[PDB]
Design an enzyme around this catalytic site. Structure first.
Site, PDB file in Angstrom:
ATOM      1  N   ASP A   1      46.492  40.810  38.748  1.00 51.42           N
ATOM      2  CA  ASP A   1      45.805  39.577  38.377  1.00 51.42           C
ATOM      3  C   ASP A   1      46.031  39.444  36.877  1.00 51.42           C
ATOM      4  O   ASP A   1      45.280  39.980  36.069  1.00 51.42           O
ATOM      5  CB  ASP A   1      44.322  39.640  38.726  1.00 51.42           C
ATOM      6  CG  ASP A   1      43.598  38.339  38.432  1.00 51.42           C
ATOM      7  OD1 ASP A   1      44.271  37.355  38.043  1.00 51.42           O
ATOM      8  OD2 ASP A   1      42.346  38.314  38.595  1.00 51.42           O
TER       9      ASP A   1
ATOM     10  N   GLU B   1      34.358  41.160  43.526  1.00 53.53           N
ATOM     11  CA  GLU B   1      34.994  41.410  42.238  1.00 53.53           C
ATOM     12  C   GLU B   1      33.990  41.192  41.118  1.00 53.53           C
ATOM     13  O   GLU B   1      33.581  40.048  40.883  1.00 53.53           O
ATOM     14  CB  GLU B   1      36.182  40.482  42.036  1.00 53.53           C
ATOM     15  CG  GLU B   1      36.862  40.714  40.694  1.00 53.53           C
ATOM     16  CD  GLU B   1      38.157  39.982  40.579  1.00 53.53           C
ATOM     17  OE1 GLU B   1      38.615  39.399  41.580  1.00 53.53           O
ATOM     18  OE2 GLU B   1      38.728  40.011  39.478  1.00 53.53           O
TER      19      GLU B   1
ATOM     20  N   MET C   1      45.697  39.667  51.067  1.00 52.18           N
ATOM     21  CA  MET C   1      44.380  39.319  50.565  1.00 52.18           C
ATOM     22  C   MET C   1      44.354  37.825  50.298  1.00 52.18           C
ATOM     23  O   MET C   1      45.359  37.232  49.897  1.00 52.18           O
ATOM     24  CB  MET C   1      44.095  40.113  49.278  1.00 52.18           C
ATOM     25  CG  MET C   1      42.748  39.828  48.610  1.00 52.18           C
ATOM     26  SD  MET C   1      42.733  38.375  47.526  1.00 52.18           S
ATOM     27  CE  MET C   1      43.327  39.105  46.003  1.00 52.18           C
TER      28      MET C   1
ATOM     29  N   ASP D   1      44.861  27.112  45.535  1.00 47.22           N
ATOM     30  CA  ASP D   1      46.208  27.344  45.016  1.00 47.22           C
ATOM     31  C   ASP D   1      47.266  26.874  46.004  1.00 47.22           C
ATOM     32  O   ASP D   1      48.358  26.454  45.605  1.00 47.22           O
ATOM     33  CB  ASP D   1      46.469  28.843  44.821  1.00 47.22           C
ATOM     34  CG  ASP D   1      45.574  29.492  43.787  1.00 47.22           C
ATOM     35  OD1 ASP D   1      45.151  28.832  42.820  1.00 47.22           O
ATOM     36  OD2 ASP D   1      45.338  30.704  43.951  1.00 47.22           O
TER      37      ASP D   1
ATOM     38  N   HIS E   1      38.098  43.525  33.370  1.00 48.18           N
ATOM     39  CA  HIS E   1      36.692  43.136  33.480  1.00 48.18           C
ATOM     40  C   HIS E   1      35.762  44.269  33.099  1.00 48.18           C
ATOM     41  O   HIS E   1      34.809  44.060  32.347  1.00 48.18           O
ATOM     42  CB  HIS E   1      36.402  42.592  34.878  1.00 48.18           C
ATOM     43  CG  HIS E   1      37.099  41.300  35.141  1.00 48.18           C
ATOM     44  ND1 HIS E   1      37.030  40.631  36.343  1.00 48.18           N
ATOM     45  CD2 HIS E   1      37.899  40.559  34.337  1.00 48.18           C
ATOM     46  CE1 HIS E   1      37.763  39.528  36.260  1.00 48.18           C
ATOM     47  NE2 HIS E   1      38.308  39.464  35.057  1.00 48.18           N
TER      48      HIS E   1
ATOM     49  N   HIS F   1      44.044  31.803  46.281  1.00 40.58           N
ATOM     50  CA  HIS F   1      42.840  31.020  46.530  1.00 40.58           C
ATOM     51  C   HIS F   1      43.216  29.853  47.425  1.00 40.58           C
ATOM     52  O   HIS F   1      44.326  29.317  47.338  1.00 40.58           O
ATOM     53  CB  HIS F   1      42.281  30.386  45.243  1.00 40.58           C
ATOM     54  CG  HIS F   1      41.902  31.362  44.176  1.00 40.58           C
ATOM     55  ND1 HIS F   1      42.816  31.887  43.293  1.00 40.58           N
ATOM     56  CD2 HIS F   1      40.701  31.886  43.830  1.00 40.58           C
ATOM     57  CE1 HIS F   1      42.198  32.702  42.457  1.00 40.58           C
ATOM     58  NE2 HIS F   1      40.916  32.730  42.769  1.00 40.58           N
TER      59      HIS F   1
ATOM     60  N   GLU G   1      38.570  44.988  38.540  1.00 40.11           N
ATOM     61  CA  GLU G   1      39.679  44.550  37.707  1.00 40.11           C
ATOM     62  C   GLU G   1      39.652  45.302  36.387  1.00 40.11           C
ATOM     63  O   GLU G   1      38.607  45.368  35.730  1.00 40.11           O
ATOM     64  CB  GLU G   1      39.626  43.037  37.447  1.00 40.11           C
ATOM     65  CG  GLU G   1      40.760  42.548  36.563  1.00 40.11           C
ATOM     66  CD  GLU G   1      40.765  41.042  36.362  1.00 40.11           C
ATOM     67  OE1 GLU G   1      40.675  40.293  37.359  1.00 40.11           O
ATOM     68  OE2 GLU G   1      40.872  40.647  35.179  1.00 40.11           O
TER      69      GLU G   1
ATOM     70  N   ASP H   1      42.538  45.012  41.174  1.00 40.16           N
ATOM     71  CA  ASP H   1      43.269  44.079  40.319  1.00 40.16           C
ATOM     72  C   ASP H   1      43.719  44.829  39.069  1.00 40.16           C
ATOM     73  O   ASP H   1      42.889  45.330  38.295  1.00 40.16           O
ATOM     74  CB  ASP H   1      42.403  42.900  39.853  1.00 40.16           C
ATOM     75  CG  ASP H   1      42.256  41.754  40.858  1.00 40.16           C
ATOM     76  OD1 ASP H   1      42.796  41.825  41.983  1.00 40.16           O
ATOM     77  OD2 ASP H   1      41.563  40.749  40.470  1.00 40.16           O
TER      78      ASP H   1
ATOM     79  N   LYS I   1      32.583  40.883  37.173  1.00 43.32           N
ATOM     80  CA  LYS I   1      33.000  40.515  35.822  1.00 43.32           C
ATOM     81  C   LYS I   1      31.737  40.332  35.003  1.00 43.32           C
ATOM     82  O   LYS I   1      30.768  39.776  35.530  1.00 43.32           O
ATOM     83  CB  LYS I   1      33.791  39.207  35.810  1.00 43.32           C
ATOM     84  CG  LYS I   1      34.458  38.887  34.483  1.00 43.32           C
ATOM     85  CD  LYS I   1      35.218  37.580  34.539  1.00 43.32           C
ATOM     86  CE  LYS I   1      35.999  37.340  33.267  1.00 43.32           C
ATOM     87  NZ  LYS I   1      36.672  36.003  33.278  1.00 43.32           N
TER      88      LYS I   1
ATOM     89  N   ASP J   1      43.757  39.171  30.615  1.00 35.55           N
ATOM     90  CA  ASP J   1      44.656  39.217  31.769  1.00 35.55           C
ATOM     91  C   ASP J   1      46.103  39.493  31.342  1.00 35.55           C
ATOM     92  O   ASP J   1      47.046  38.844  31.801  1.00 35.55           O
ATOM     93  CB  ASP J   1      44.566  37.922  32.593  1.00 35.55           C
ATOM     94  CG  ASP J   1      43.275  37.796  33.389  1.00 35.55           C
ATOM     95  OD1 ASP J   1      42.484  38.752  33.453  1.00 35.55           O
ATOM     96  OD2 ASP J   1      43.060  36.703  33.954  1.00 35.55           O
TER      97      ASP J   1
ATOM     98  N   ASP K   1      38.554  37.379  28.450  1.00 35.70           N
ATOM     99  CA  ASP K   1      39.366  37.994  29.500  1.00 35.70           C
ATOM    100  C   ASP K   1      40.837  37.661  29.261  1.00 35.70           C
ATOM    101  O   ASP K   1      41.259  36.516  29.443  1.00 35.70           O
ATOM    102  CB  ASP K   1      38.852  37.417  30.818  1.00 35.70           C
ATOM    103  CG  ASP K   1      39.508  37.982  32.060  1.00 35.70           C
ATOM    104  OD1 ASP K   1      39.833  39.180  32.122  1.00 35.70           O
ATOM    105  OD2 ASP K   1      39.601  37.201  33.034  1.00 35.70           O
TER     106      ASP K   1
HETATM  107 MG   LIG Z   1      40.665  39.355  39.283  1.00 41.97          MG
HETATM  108 MG   LIG Z   2      40.460  38.816  34.344  1.00 43.17          MG
END
Ligand SMILES: [Mg+2]
Ligand SMILES: [Mg+2]
Ligand SMILES: [Mg+2]
Ligand SMILES: [Mg+2]
Ligand SMILES: [Mg+2]
Ligand SMILES: [Mg+2]
Ligand SMILES: [Mg+2]
Ligand SMILES: [Mg+2]
Ligand code: NA
Ligand code: NA
Ligand code: NA
Ligand code: NA
Ligand code: NA
Ligand code: NA
Ligand code: NA
Ligand code: NA
Lengths: 385, 385, 385, 385
Positions: free
Chosen positions: A285, A179, A86, A55, A218, A52, A215, A243, A181, A255, A253
């Site tokens: 991710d 993406e 990406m 980031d 998700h 991002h 993802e 992802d 979710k 992850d 979530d």
């Molecule tokens: Mg993601």
């Molecule tokens: Mg996630």
């Protein structure tokens, strides 16, 4: 099961860099310099990293500070051979985005969200990214009156159409990936699944520029079958990026590292990606759990890649096994791939074997042999053949 | 809150006619003659009824028996003024459909499924139906190797394309509506949500002939926001029909009477349908619980209509209240409806107020006032204003 | 991975005998004679079978017919060496039980339910069963006013107390096991999880006679961790029996073969049962999918046992691996097993190292090393060490 | 619907004081001084407030600072007449608790957790609290090998037994209430539901000192019926305290204002609490959404109390309506409250009307009339009688 850059494994800076702050707890790890993350991931065999905007460049940085942050990052990429396939925009952390970016009720916030995105598209192209992801994590609502969803979808379309006009006018070879979710951090998020995102894309002015970035976790937060959703995205020609992670069912979530969560779904996912010839990045991710120190961060990241490689081997062995190929024919997977009525509508209507003289009871008595096939798949996954 | 035929309330024959057989129990009620159901529903104020082929004509009936069943039904419609706005095919009960109809692995079953559907399209047109629903309840899998989903989607597209060719060649004014469901009776069903169905329609040869028939409880079986999904279907121009019922969260398909289950979601649904001017049937796909005798069947059916009418009144009062209209402006719903950048991309890029001179902290400090708005909505729903 | 009777694998008559009728479809397989099921299961290596009263003796049979059915079954057991370790009552299929058995609102139904149960307890003892299971599948409600849950729990306690009085008065060496399920076929079922059942048992007059019969898929229908729930039942001394199967998340009760569904949960379950020395039957409550013919029924049953044996091998290898034993110490599993304060309350209060001089930051910095441990567990499960 | 202190409505300092930091976003509101919260809540009609140690005294404060924080808070209570009926410990925010407090693998952390708790018990008693809540939010795991649940339950029992020894030795009139939650922030939390907590309490050395503090949204995160769980806690005599809020199904813990989420469940909950004569605090554990400014915080808090009062009125009207009382008899709720067999076991065995001469078909034909009853309940909730 040693990864190499040819395996196309990529990681977000925010993954291994997650400091461990959750809704109920403070950070358990110090912040990582992006340059350190690039070097450590390269040593593990990764192909590249993703980011991002916020980031890589701290929010609010001056133009001179922004230049220094990019220059340092660029040198780390050059020193390691790592790529940046990406990039994406953070339209979710800052309080200004509390009601969304592209679909915030306040018009001035929507315009700001677009300008913030456009600035990072320029940077993404400069760094060589081929895909630009949009996760609309704040687009949605906790209550029914707060958001007219038809108007919100108009605003979402307007935003994506403007971004398509921008990249076309600049001559950029980048594509967008939405993406989905279903919820979290909003009570319900707009475009909650792969299906909703695919449907929305078909109403954009230039649909060819847009695909999905599904993802694992998700879709599983809606209890959906992730391999099935990926198959629909592939069928539509829209799987631009993916992802990979793990999730234990319908909850927040998680992850988790890839391979954790629903292991059999991970097997069927790898089987599908490899059989279909998906050529994009295998992007993780994930969040190393906040119980871990930095040694555990790198162990968790290495585990993502290891699990993909083990599953790839097992899925390939499954498909290559003559006993499995026989079982697939016994279950009529070959017949599923043949047209129902290549003879055409009129021939079907005139075919007495299709209705008037069809023996429904004899057809109904045929077993599908799916349990034997599935136990062969289990035996291959577990290395028990 | 007395329904009249002008309210367009419709019921499937299989709803009030459900005998109460569930996976763990035998029937608790005798079978209802379709003629009796038509007469009783007309007395309650219903507008019409809907049917699967096999609800009206027992499976395996000869052509002469089929004629007598249709003739009796026709007279009941004539005697009562009831209409038949929608019909559908049973491609799920008979053992021949154990692996699907349109996407069965066996090609001969797929051809039979198409012929069975086509015969009922002819009957539906004869009875005046404007919408033909397809619920692919057996299209799916329990295990990953049993169904190649890309091939299955090819077969699903082939089937729907052939049906579109049939209705066009015959000159019929009927349209198709696909009903999604995420699971049950298959472990995962293909096209599991409104979004997946909308996306699939865009790949058909004549997409204008196809829409969705969403069901309240089905989207809720994936934990999704049903009003949001309906808004996306309306936004796409694809809400051809709707199934109204209730569901308590993520579990087996309960098919409770409308208004049961998630009551606030029912309020927001009615608000949306009435505000958008949805003009199709308000169809109930529900099951009177097997605890009930026939008096309870008719009480449950009456309750479906009563709850719609109460919620319609409360949603109208909410939208008409000047204090609510003020609250909507305070929450910037008016700004959500205005274009983000009707001035165009170049003007947005040149607008320093959109980025360089945007006061992010002042914008972030503005409350959305959503909780006050939602409490006004609660007060209106409960009649506590 | 060949099972033998020493492995204690057992199957219900209703499992391999399930004809495939689901809420949306007719039976796809003919009924099996219980004698045939006993013989086929013995050939596969099973240890025994279990039954509901109505699986073995058709409902409504005269005393003479009941005698002949038992005699035939008895000879099949004698011919094969198969045992009957558990029996149960069908208090769910017949329409009389539509509102429950022990907690039906109608008092005459509650008395009938008790008499039906008592008659089958006598038969269970005659056949050598050591455990009598109760699954209260109809005990519950679809709506809030239909069932006062405090009164229902009084009736449930009354029923179980009377059954305990009966077995004590007859001198029987049988114990009871309550099987929880959260929903289906009722909208909500009373005693919905292992925890609720354990809590209820402590209010019975003779709690020592009662334990739990948890089922993998049932706890997973509430999104709970099945191994954790089994650990609590073992900790309480109440794991009298267990039902093994698979389930893909929060949806209808799938009753897949064991090993399907959540594979990693199956691994951790087997690890726990074997480490704790659980000595009861390994009972499969599963349904061969209705896609299958009889060959697929027996393949699915064989797969239940095969998957248990593979997982047993992998869990044993995990626990025996010196590298895993090292990792367990690195993660302080050894310290978890030591008392927090065997020195007592006063010593803890006087211990400055426990508060006044405790270095919270140094303790917080210690990683738990859980990700490395979990990847060793993954590698062992997959045979990738 | 104006609340007064006699209504016993209480709020945690951390509720209205939540700054809006979520896993994906920074705080949207400034911190509130506890003294301001006390004054504003008193003006709204609240009865009292509750606190974690770390909400009132910043972590790491010296003894002199701790004294000043308590003194200021004490004066605000005196100035307003507000009470403090409950207190609790924060064993979840600081990184030292990343693997738990009472069940952390590290023994030194477990001892610290106990000392931190004991210090706050002393303060709670000084401020007049009658209940001490424990929410073990970090007790659990993300992976199977990280936590031996039997050992963890031994450590949990040891901790609670030591706390009981402490309060008994000091002569304190406080009781403990365990708050279950199924997951979040840990992948699975120990004692995940009301049932598991009730079962655990029965293994403590002094079970009379311990009850439950169930939270609406937490049981709903497992898809369970919250009123049913409350009924079981009341039946066991263990409902010491309750947390009221709202939740939309199985997802992250939303902590919406009470009345939001599942509105019909809220109605049945209030009906049960009022009918049973629950006399404890009506405590709200909720989070004003981060979209809101401070005006929205107070509107959301006021809405909690308003919704309770509306539902109380509607439930009372339902139970007082002669037509509802008739419907309850028609559905045999009166018979549910009568003993099944007060005549005893032998009389039941000798009663031919209970089995040999019981007309199962006549009993099965009786409708339960539950749908009519439930529509009366709907009409009362909506004020449509
Ligand atoms: Mg993601
Ligand atoms: Mg996630
Ligand atoms: Mg349904
Ligand atoms: Mg439907
Ligand atoms: Mg089951
Ligand atoms: Mg079972
Ligand atoms: Mg909560
Ligand atoms: Mg709470
Ligand atoms: Na576009
Ligand atoms: Na997963
Ligand atoms: Na077409
Ligand atoms: Na509902
Ligand atoms: Na007893
Ligand atoms: Na499972
Ligand atoms: Na104790
Ligand atoms: Na709720």
């Amino acid at each position: 099961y040693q990864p190499t850059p040819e395996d196309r494994f990529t990681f977000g800076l925010w993954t291994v860099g997650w400091q461990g702050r959750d809704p109920f707890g403070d950070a358990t790890r110090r912040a990582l310099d992006p340059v350190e993350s690039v070097r450590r991931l390269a040593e593990l065999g990764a192909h590249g990293v993703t980011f991002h905007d916020d980031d890589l460049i701290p929010f609010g940085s001056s133009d001179s500070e922004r230049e220094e942050h990019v220059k340092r990052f660029r040198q780390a990429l050059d020193d390691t051979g790592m790529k940046v396939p990406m990039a994406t925009t953070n339209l979710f952390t800052h309080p200004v985005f509390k009601d969304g970016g592209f679909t915030a009720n306040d018009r001035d916030v929507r315009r700001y969200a677009l300008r913030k995105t456009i600035r990072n598209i320029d940077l993404a192209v400069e760094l060589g990214a081929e895909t630009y992801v949009a996760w609309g994590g704040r687009e949605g609502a906790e209550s029914g009156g707060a958001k007219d969803v038809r108007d919100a979808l108009d605003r979402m379309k307007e935003a994506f159409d403007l971004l398509g006009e921008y990249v076309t006018s600049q001559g950029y070879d980048i594509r967008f990936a939405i993406e989905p979710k279903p919820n979290e951090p909003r009570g319900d998020i707009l475009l909650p699944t792969v299906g909703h995102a695919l449907a929305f894309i078909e109403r954009l002015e230039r649909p060819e520029l847009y695909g999905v970035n599904p993802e694992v976790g998700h879709e599983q937060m809606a209890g959906l079958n992730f391999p099935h959703g990926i198959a629909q995205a592939l069928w539509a020609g829209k799987l631009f990026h993916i992802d990979l992670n793990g999730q234990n069912g319908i909850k927040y979530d998680q992850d988790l590292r890839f391979g954790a969560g629903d292991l059999r779904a991970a097997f069927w996912l790898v089987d599908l990606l490899e059989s279909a010839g998906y050529s994009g990045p295998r992007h993780f991710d994930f969040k190393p759990p906040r119980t871990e120190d930095f040694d555990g961060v790198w162990a968790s990241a290495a585990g993502c890649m290891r699990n993909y490689l083990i599953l790839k081997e097992r899925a390939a062995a499954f498909r290559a096994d003559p006993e499995v190929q026989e079982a697939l024919r016994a279950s009529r997977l070959d017949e599923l791939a043949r047209p129902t009525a290549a003879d055409g509508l009129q021939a079907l209507l005139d075919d007495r074997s299709a209705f008037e003289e069809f023996d429904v009871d004899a057809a109904a008595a045929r077993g599908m042999a799916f349990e034997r096939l599935d136990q062969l798949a289990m035996d291959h996954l577990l290395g028990a053949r």
